[PDB]
């Protein structure tokens, strides 16, 4: 027989690494079977909402979130924008999301990859279709801006064009080291709880014919309003692999939180879910190219991604 | 005021309906930036047109061994028009004029090199697609690279049944028009351009109009041409 | 620009004498000769053409427009449009970016000189155009900017001051005759300044320098450029004193020479 | 990728195109057969051209009109290629030489042409109007994709049918097809495009200085017909006689009549493919109203 | 269900196939093995290139992900160590979607499967299984699992689901359930009905997906 | 004879001693032998001999395979020669021809037709064909047609010699013709009218499938040739 | 002497040579550019009037290292394509392990001296360094002008007053040195013949008057003159009228030099 | 942009001395990271520098090695891209004569600085010192040979980078400002150079 150090052999092989780890009975993270990276986060950081009283009038940030899990650090801040509604239960046609886009900064500079673009549409999918955001809770509750007394212009709301809220999302992922969906919507997660609508207004005519030679909806600089996400549908993201032991390096071990090259490489059963704490589940990903996905471990890992949600969410009051 | 086509037969610039714009032409403009050069003034257009080559190839994998790499850049200054701050049409040009020269520059006689022609429009007014075709021919001609015959290019619009001879912008937003590319004296179209709807019957007296109108600017452009062989064989003597 | 070693080390050596041995005999800082044309857009309020004696060219049009100046913050707009480069390459944003410092509505160009009305001002279109460029186009640019602001010539107003849109006379026009700045460009060769360095001896340079001037004295914006990457080395704080007193001194003559209209 | 054709295969087809024999068994002036399919929704149809397989599907979707022209909605159309079609086809380079060009046929042909009528389209003059889109989805290739294109997309924007919409001022209500019956668009004229394939037998010093032109021309040209051709011209009528456009960017030159006399052949097609594009929506509009009396 | 296909109806391509389940609809064309490009090579085993067309407009992510989703079906059915240094050319045209495609993909994405595993099949690339997708939706008050929903059940379905497995032994083994795309709101209980429901009527659908291959390849060959 | 799935249960037993051909695959890891086609499984009798029939346009080079190329490159000892488009290219030696020496070498040319056969068909390597015979009718295709196919017509059109296809096409014309197991037929006839007869009627055959109905196709062919 | 343009017709005799610059179609010969009819013999040809350098076998050309090769480099010699130089056609200060290692005598951007040892079939030109004449380039700096100007003569390096040495490439790519040992003996120990290093005793002198030797070439170019051996020292005798070399780059200072030159040999 | 959801495009956007702490080696995925924020008592500012390589480029004949520096908004999106590309600019001009390039040939070095929060309590004249400390003390984490310790001040403007105990200035950089302060300012710059060179050597040693 030859062996060589653990540093070549996780660049010789990666299938060998996670083999001659798993015969050892530890994982290339160094973490145990069923453990999950430690999180830390930072919640509206970058919010022009962060100060009650100086309100940054520069910033354009709704809500933001800072997260850190093991190695890799992830931000998200949340952007806004109105549309005019052109237009006349718990169905899915009443619920709206946001337009993530996902930066995983690497040593490249170029074009969106795949991985950036697939993680924007599973942001968004999985929003919408675990029914956080309705969109009635984007409706623009629009005021009236007129001249009081004779200068100083007073701003009314309501305690008939009509407007939307349209919300965006900018994630950038810093020292990637595996799997980072899971830390982008949890980051998102995080960030949407902290988003704060700014309200509109409008002052109290390019159809009519003019001499030669001779509107829209505004912001507030200050007042904002919360934006009221169905708060029970808040789900937390978990991510599981299911590995068969080589004889030479009939067996399988189920492994939480993918990390490092040698994990994400060579295990190809993984199982994907979003759970909401004390509620149901909100996304559940099978996908079978490497052991066979039984139903212990589906079982495992659903009883998995429960505690998980409920750690995150508790964790940070 | 103005009109369009006045019943005395009069156009906008006062031109009648067999009338070319100010045609004006220069050989050898950019020596220090070009093997072969040309500037364009017919009418109110203003053509910079720029030959590089044949020349080796930047990179060994784009180069073909049996014939001459043709490029061209058509590059519409910003302050060409009553400026937009505003792509896919111009990749039409390009290519089309690329197309038109493939077949008259003996790319065969010139392997294993590469030809870049660098256009700039500095103001632009109607029939630019003939004007730029003018440019190159000049051009090319300036660089010594060996070409079949001249290629001419014109612009026709018809006003009810008379074809207007030379368009300008505000000819060519009030009727159809077409697009010739005439080889040399001959009455082969290397390029044939209807870009709107003409009636199937008075179509062919545009293209006689054209094709006409073709020869008067080969004519030009060589009248020119050899204006500055004799004047560069005479300083030199 | 390629050169053999053979050829980088006997420049070097020449330009870092005492004193400085330029290539082609020119002082530290002599001009090299330059061919200007203008008024030849007619469809511009104002054109230049500039030819450097290396082949480097550069076509500038002036182009107006009536805009609110209580809505419009700059009014003066330079886009620089390089042959041969992408119009988001690094050269050219950076050149965008420093022209437009260089004229900004309210430091070296006179901004009140582009008001019409009380509510509507001139906003100007600065295109610059380089048709060929073998080192640093921004003095070159600077010069043709400088050359096309001159030779520009605006429509007459008729109506009042205070304020419906201004009103222009038909045929009358006014000279613009607002103050343009000129932007030098330097290298910085051992223990000398050059003026106005030509491409052979900015690929031996140790560094250089961006050097703006209006109104007869030193204005801003001021870089410290990087002509090559090869031979880029520390430079002395006096090495940059001696170069704006340069600018100081020589520059005059580079603007009676260009004003000669 | 390239498709590499041999020698023997090359001087074959060109020496049976001077014994005046076409592979498929046409003459040089035959218009390949017309098949079009209609599916089950409105503007989903299907073309076919012997081995030529395009589909178009229409769709509209309510926006707002550019202010510059506020009495005109929105029209599009969408040519994307994919590898389906053949391996030759890079996936959705829309830069490519003969993507560029092709797109703009199109383009020229149905958009600039004003076949449909983006009048029609607007809701209100201010703002709320149709946004009509074309995609083009080439399935398989075996030449002739401008042709199929052209005539895929016009039999598309005449079998569909926009939802009906009522409009209580400011409140514009898209009725669905379970409540009020849609209204179909309106089509000022049907523009065929025919595309003439030219083949040189002789030598390129005979083309320029030649006294009789020797170019063999054929109409509607299969794959390996097209790609050994010498040039190409693509011409679009109606039959209201009129010239839509015309393209014959660079390649082998044509003597001028000839090209003329191209537009006058393909005259004679474009009556029968018009007729036969009018003749099969007629028959599909009689299949429904037969269901309607079962239902 | 009620499924019906066709295989082998381009021209150009290694192998084609046609697939319609209710009212979606994709044909799907296979190109391999064949020389591939430099980025896409592979020393070992073959490369896939999987591309995917929407019915309307241009291609968004929301194609990309299901380009994603197909790969992961596609890639353990496909004998990839066969063609070492290959490529395959697995592309899908959906034609009509059969369901709001602003807010459903799951019709789509197990039509494109069955569609991809087809053409697979006419292409003749060494495949190591069988394979079938069905899509399954639980609708709101009912709380029923209804196999094969409608456009109009996905309305008011409460969770969506893509269910594909491999099936080994004349289709009546499950070798792996090679793809398993849930959401919506559920639970356990709910999660293994939903796989004992749609493992039957997975079965189902290898069972007719043999009978249309054999139907199909068998007047192809000599006996 | 049986029709078989990929990942079905393989009939025969591992105690008889059987050759692999075409459609079975044996798993490095489990050692099954398990089928990867789709198709009709022919087993012989007695030694057994067991492969699966099924339909394919993309041919793989295999050795002592009968094949059609074009000349695409002339590289330093070897031509690039290509079997099929979009493929991977092949390697054509210049050694590999009858009395070849290092003082002639072939006269070929690019794009021209070459029959040969597959002698090196490494999955790792690129393949190679040669033209000169193995166990001693290769060399150039001058002029003439080819003809696309799909690789079972091609098969059968080389080894069965009840296949109606050559004999009704010797029946209308004299005709010189050339199979490749890579679905490529090169025709070549006397005058241009035969030699496209027989491009139309292998054309039609092909996609009929059906062996009755060959003999009325070349007889309404050539009917319309004339 | 004919002036000619493209697509004109030449002759419509067909008993003659089809030479460069035409083509043909039965009788009728065409021209293919714009040029001047040459009929020598049998061979009617037209001789474009521009172009880049065409190399000819013999022709002594000056150039730039453009990459390194296999076996062999290809040099910018300033024509259409480059020029090969094999390794067996340089003077190596063969073994093989001197094939690897060939950046250590000539890198890209290296400036040499070779010879026009034969042409290829496309035109390209093939060179060899197998004299004392030919190799790296150093002790100077290099300048070019067209081709044309350069006319071709037996000898084409020149050492000139002032201890400055010129090599005139056919080409137009000039090289100016300081004259070296072997630079005199050109009248009737170097083991580093690559060395990438100027000799270190190049005096100020020396420096000024390749300048001004640099703008007389320039100024020759400028006015179109054909630049030899005997105007190069015509020019730099005249040029000393100005104190400063750098005086001679303004317009009417070139314009001068070279009227000066033409009316002097009018006279002469 | 298809590669991304940019949502409905009716829809428009919404219209309304120095304490410093370094950190050193935190990403893993390139050669070498830093960590800078500062809090002075009008404006705080963090960014992220990630430095990789040297990382050979295919068939390079380069004697020396090829810096890039690409200054992004990593997030907050506060500064126009004409005048990050013109810092980048800036900060590739010194570094270029910082980096012991001759020491990597054929090879490329990569430099990233993410900008992750900007509050003032234009600016870019005041961020560039900043950038300036994360890349020296990143190419330090590195690996990368530099001839000195690269840090710069700011003061009414002018941004000044120093090596060599501010004997030698290796940038400099004026927008607006008064005339005449060249004196004053370099003198202000050579302060914080010298503090910051002083808190970045005290960085990579403990
Ligand atoms: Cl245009
Ligand atoms: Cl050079
Ligand atoms: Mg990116």
Redesign the pocket.
């Known amino acids: 027989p030859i062996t060589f150090p653990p540093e070549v052999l996780a660049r010789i092989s990666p299938e060998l690494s996670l083999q001659r780890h798993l015969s050892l009975g530890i994982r290339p993270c160094l973490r145990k079977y069923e453990e999950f990276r430690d999180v830390a986060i930072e919640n509206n950081t970058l919010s022009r909402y962060a100060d009650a009283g100086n309100i940054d009038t520069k910033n354009n940030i709704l809500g933001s979130n800072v997260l850190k899990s093991g190695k890799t650090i992830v931000i998200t801040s949340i952007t806004g924008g109105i549309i005019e509604e052109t237009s006349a239960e718990d169905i899915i046609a009443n619920y709206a999301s946001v337009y993530p886009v996902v930066?995983?900064?690497?040593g490249?500079?170029?074009?969106?990859?795949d991985e950036?673009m697939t993680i924007s549409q599973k942001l968004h999918d999985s929003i919408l279709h675990s029914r956080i955001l309705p969109k009635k809770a984007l409706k623009v509750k629009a005021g009236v801006r007129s001249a009081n007394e004779d200068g100083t212009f007073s701003v009314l709301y309501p305690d008939k064009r009509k407007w939307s809220y349209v919300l965006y999302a900018k994630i950038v992922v810093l020292s990637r080291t595996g799997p980072v969906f899971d830390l982008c919507w949890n980051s998102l997660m995080y960030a949407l709880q902290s988003v704060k609508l700014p309200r509109a207004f409008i002052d109290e005519l390019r159809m009519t014919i003019r001499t030669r030679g001779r509107y829209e909806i505004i912001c507030d600089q200050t007042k904002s309003v919360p934006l009221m996400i169905n708060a029970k549908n808040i789900a937390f993201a978990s991510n599981y692999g299911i590995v068969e032991l080589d004889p030479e390096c009939l067996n399988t071990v189920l492994i939480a939180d993918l990390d490092t090259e040698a994990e994400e490489t060579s295990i190809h059963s993984t199982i994907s879910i979003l759970a909401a704490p004390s509620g149901n589940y909100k996304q559940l990903t099978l996908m079978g190219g490497g052991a066979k996905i039984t139903p212990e471990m589906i079982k495992r890992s659903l009883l998995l991604s429960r505690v998980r949600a409920d750690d995150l969410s508790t964790r940070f009051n | 005021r103005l009109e369009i086509y006045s019943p005395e037969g009069l156009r906008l610039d006062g031109r009648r309906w067999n009338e070319l714009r100010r045609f004006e032409s220069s050989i050898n403009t950019h020596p220090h930036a070009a093997d072969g050069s040309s500037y364009m003034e017919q009418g109110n257009n203003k053509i910079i047109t720029l030959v590089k080559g044949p020349k080796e190839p930047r990179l060994k994998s784009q180069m073909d061994t049996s014939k001459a790499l043709l490029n061209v850049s058509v590059n519409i200054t910003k302050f060409s028009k009553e400026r937009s701050k505003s792509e896919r049409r111009v990749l039409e040009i390009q290519t089309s004029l690329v197309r038109m020269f493939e077949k008259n520059v003996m790319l065969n006689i010139y392997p294993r090199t590469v030809i870049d022609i660098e256009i700039h429009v500095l103001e632009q007014d109607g029939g630019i697609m003939g004007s730029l075709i003018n440019g190159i021919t000049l051009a090319l001609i300036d660089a010594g690279i060996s070409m079949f015959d001249y290629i001419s290019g014109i612009s026709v619009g018809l006003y009810d049944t008379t074809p207007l001879l030379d368009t300008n912008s505000l000819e060519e937003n009030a009727m159809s028009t077409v697009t010739l590319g005439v080889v040399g004296k001959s009455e082969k179209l290397s390029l044939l351009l209807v870009e709107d709807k003409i009636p199937l019957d008075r179509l062919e007296n545009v293209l006689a109009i054209g094709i006409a109108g073709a020869h008067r600017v080969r004519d030009l452009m060589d009248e020119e041409l050899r204006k500055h062989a004799q004047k560069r064989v005479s300083n030199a003597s | 620009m390629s050169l053999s070693v053979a050829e980088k080390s006997y420049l070097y050596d020449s330009l870092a004498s005492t004193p400085s041995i330029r290539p082609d005999g020119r002082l530290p800082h002599q001009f090299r000769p330059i061919e200007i044309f203008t008024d030849f857009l007619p469809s511009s309020n104002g054109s230049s053409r500039i030819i450097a004696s290396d082949g480097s060219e550069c076509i500038v049009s002036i182009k107006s427009k009536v805009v609110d100046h209580h809505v419009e913050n700059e009014l003066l707009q330079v886009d620089v449009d390089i042959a041969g480069q992408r119009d988001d390459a690094l050269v050219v944003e950076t050149i965008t970016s420093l022209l437009n410092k260089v004229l900004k509505s309210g430091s070296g160009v006179d901004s009140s000189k582009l008001q019409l009305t009380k509510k509507y001002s001139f906003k100007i279109f600065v295109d610059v155009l380089v048709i060929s460029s073998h080192s640093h186009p921004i003095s070159l640019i600077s010069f043709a900017i400088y050359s096309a602001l001159n030779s520009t010539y605006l429509p007459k107003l008729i109506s009042a001051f205070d304020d419906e849109l201004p009103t222009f006379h038909d045929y009358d026009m006014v000279k613009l005759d607002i103050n343009p700045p000129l932007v030098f460009i330097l290298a910085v060769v051992g223990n000398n300044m050059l003026l106005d360095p030509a491409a052979n001896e900015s690929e031996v340079a140790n560094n250089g320098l961006i050097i703006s001037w209006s109104n007869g004295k030193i204005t801003s914006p001021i870089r410290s450029v990087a002509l090559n990457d090869s031979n880029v080395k520390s430079f002395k704080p006096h090495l940059l004193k001696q170069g704006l007193a340069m600018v100081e001194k020589y520059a005059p003559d580079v603007v009676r020479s260009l004003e000669n209209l | 990728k390239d498709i590499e054709i041999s020698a023997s295969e090359s001087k074959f087809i060109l020496e049976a195109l001077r014994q005046n024999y076409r592979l498929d068994g046409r003459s040089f002036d035959q218009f390949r057969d017309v098949e079009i399919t209609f599916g089950k929704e409105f503007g989903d149809v299907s073309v076919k051209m012997g081995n030529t397989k395009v589909h178009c599907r229409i769709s509209c979707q309510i926006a707002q009109p550019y202010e510059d022209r506020p009495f005109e909605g929105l029209f599009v159309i969408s040519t994307e290629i994919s590898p389906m079609a053949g391996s030759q086809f890079e996936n959705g380079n829309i830069t490519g030489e003969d993507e560029v060009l092709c797109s703009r046929i199109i383009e020229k042909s149905v958009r600039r042409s004003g076949a449909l009528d983006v009048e029609g389209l607007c809701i209100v003059a201010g703002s709320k109007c149709w946004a009509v889109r074309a995609d083009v989805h080439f399935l398989d290739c075996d030449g002739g994709f401008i042709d199929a294109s052209c005539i895929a997309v016009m039999a598309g924007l005449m079998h569909f049918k926009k939802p009906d919409i009522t409009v209580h001022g400011e409140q514009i209500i898209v009725h669905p097809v379970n409540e009020r019956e849609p209204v179909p668009l309106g089509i000022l004229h049907i523009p065929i495009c025919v595309t003439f394939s030219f083949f040189n037998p002789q030598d390129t010093e005979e083309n320029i200085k030649g006294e009789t032109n020797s170019e063999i021309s054929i109409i509607d040209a299969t794959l390996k017909e097209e790609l050994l051709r010498d040039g190409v011209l693509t011409v679009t009528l109606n039959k209201n006689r009129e010239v839509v456009q015309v393209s014959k960017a660079g390649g082998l030159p044509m003597d001028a009549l000839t090209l003329m006399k191209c537009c006058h052949e393909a005259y004679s097609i474009i009556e029968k493919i018009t007729d036969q594009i009018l003749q099969l929506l007629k028959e599909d509009s009689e299949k429904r109203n037969k269901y309607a009396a079962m239902l | 269900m009620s499924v019906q296909a066709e295989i082998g109806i381009l021209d150009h391509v290694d192998g084609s196939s046609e697939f319609v389940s209710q009212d979606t609809k994709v044909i799907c064309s296979v190109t391999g093995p064949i020389e591939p490009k430099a980025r896409q090579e592979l020393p070992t085993q073959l490369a896939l290139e999987i591309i995917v067309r929407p019915a309307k407009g241009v291609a968004t992510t929301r194609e990309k992900v299901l380009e994603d989703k197909l790969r992961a079906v596609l890639t353990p059915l496909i004998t990839r160590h066969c063609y070492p240094r290959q490529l395959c050319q697995i592309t899908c045209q959906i034609l009509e979607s059969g369901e709001d495609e602003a807010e459903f993909s799951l019709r789509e994405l197990s039509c494109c499967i069955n569609a991809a595993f087809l053409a697979l099949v006419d292409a003749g690339i060494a495949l190591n299984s069988m394979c079938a997708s069905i899509p399954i939706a639980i609708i709101k008050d009912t709380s029923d699992i209804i196999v094969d929903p409608t456009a109009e059940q996905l309305k008011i379905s409460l969770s969506v689901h893509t269910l594909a497995l491999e099936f080994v032994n004349g289709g009546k083994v499950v070798k792996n359930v090679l793809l398993l795309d849930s959401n919506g709101d559920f639970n356990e209980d709910q999660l293994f009905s939903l796989l004992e429901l749609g493992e039957q009527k997975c079965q189902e659908l290898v069972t007719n997906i043999r009978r249309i291959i054999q139907d199909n390849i068998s007047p192809r060959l000599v006996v | 004879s049986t029709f078989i799935f990929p990942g079905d249960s393989f009939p025969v037993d591992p105690t008889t001693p059987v050759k692999l051909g075409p459609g079975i695959y044996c798993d490095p890891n489990t050692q099954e032998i398990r089928p990867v086609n789709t198709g009709v499984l022919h087993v012989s009798a007695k030694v057994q001999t067991a492969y699966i029939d099924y339909s394919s346009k993309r041919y793989i080079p295999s050795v002592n395979d009968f094949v059609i190329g074009v000349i695409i490159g002339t590289f330093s000892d070897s031509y690039k020669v290509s079997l099929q488009n979009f493929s991977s290219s092949v390697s054509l030696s210049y050694m590999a021809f009858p009395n070849a020496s290092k003082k002639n070498r072939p006269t070929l040319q690019v794009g021209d037709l070459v029959y040969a056969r597959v002698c090196t068909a490494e999955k790792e390597l690129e393949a190679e064909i040669e033209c000169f015979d193995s166990t001693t009718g290769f060399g150039i295709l001058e002029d003439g047609m080819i003809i696309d196919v799909n690789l079972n017509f091609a098969r059968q059109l080389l080894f069965n010699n009840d296949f109606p296809l050559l004999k009704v096409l010797a029946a209308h014309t004299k005709f010189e013709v050339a199979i490749g197991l890579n679905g490529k037929i090169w025709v070549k006839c006397e005058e241009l009218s035969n030699t496209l007869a027989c491009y139309r009627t292998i054309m039609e055959c092909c996609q009929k499938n059906d062996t009755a109905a060959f003999k009325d196709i070349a007889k309404r062919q050539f009917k319309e040739i004339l | 002497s004919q002036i000619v343009t493209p697509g004109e017709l030449v002759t419509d005799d067909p008993i003659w040579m089809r030479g460069h610059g035409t083509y043909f179609l039965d009788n009728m010969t065409y021209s293919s550019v714009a040029g001047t009819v040459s009929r020598v013999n049998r061979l009617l040809s037209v001789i474009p009037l521009k172009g880049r350098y065409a190399p000819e076998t013999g022709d002594h050309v000056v150039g730039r290292i453009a990459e390194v090769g296999n076996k062999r480099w290809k040099v910018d010699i300033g024509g259409k394509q480059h020029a090969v130089l094999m390794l067996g056609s340089v003077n190596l200060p063969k073994s093989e392990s001197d094939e690897l290692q060939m950046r250590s005598f000539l890198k890209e951007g290296d400036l040499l001296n070779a010879e026009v040892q034969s042409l290829f079939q496309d035109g390209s030109a093939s060179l060899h360094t197998r004299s004392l004449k030919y190799g790296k380039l150093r002790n100077g700096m290099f300048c070019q002008v067209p081709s044309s100007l350069i006319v071709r003569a037996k000898n084409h390096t020149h050492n000139l007053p002032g201890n400055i040495t010129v090599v005139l490439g056919v080409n137009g790519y000039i090289w100016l040195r300081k004259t070296s040992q072997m630079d005199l003996a050109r009248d009737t120990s170097s083991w580093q013949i690559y060395s990438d290093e100027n000799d270190p005793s190049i005096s100020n002198n020396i420096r000024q008057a390749i300048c001004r030797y640099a703008n007389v070439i320039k100024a020759l170019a400028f006015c179109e003159i054909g630049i030899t051996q005997q105007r190069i020292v015509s020019a730099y005798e005249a040029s000393m009228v100005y104190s400063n070399v750098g005086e001679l780059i303004e317009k009417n200072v070139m314009e001068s030099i070279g009227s000066d030159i033409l009316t002097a040999e009018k006279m002469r | 942009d298809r590669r991304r959801l940019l949502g409905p495009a009716a829809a428009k956007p919404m219209a309304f001395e120095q304490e410093l702490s370094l950190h050193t080696g935190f990403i893993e995925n390139c050669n070498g990271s830093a960590l800078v924020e500062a809090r002075s008592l009008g404006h705080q500012t963090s960014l992220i520098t990630a430095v990789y390589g040297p990382r050979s480029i295919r068939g390079s004949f380069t004697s020396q090695g090829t810096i890039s520096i690409q200054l992004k908004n990593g997030l907050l999106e506060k500064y126009n891209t004409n005048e990050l590309k013109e810092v980048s600019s800036f900060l590739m001009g010194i570094f270029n004569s910082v980096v012991n390039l001759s020491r990597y040939p054929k090879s490329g070095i990569d430099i990233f600085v993410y900008l992750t929060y900007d509050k003032d309590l234009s600016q870019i004249s005041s961020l560039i010192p900043h950038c300036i400390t994360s890349i020296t003390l990143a190419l330090a984490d590195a690996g990368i040979e530099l001839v000195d310790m690269a840090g710069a001040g700011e003061a009414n403007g002018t941004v000044v980078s120093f090596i060599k105990n501010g004997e030698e200035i290796v940038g400099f950089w004026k927008d607006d400002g008064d005339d005449e302060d060249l004196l004053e300012c370099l003198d202000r710059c050579k302060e914080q150079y010298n503090r910051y060179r002083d808190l970045m050597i005290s960085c990579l040693m403990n």
């Open positions: 930066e995983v900064e690497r490249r500079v170029g074009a969106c990859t950036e």
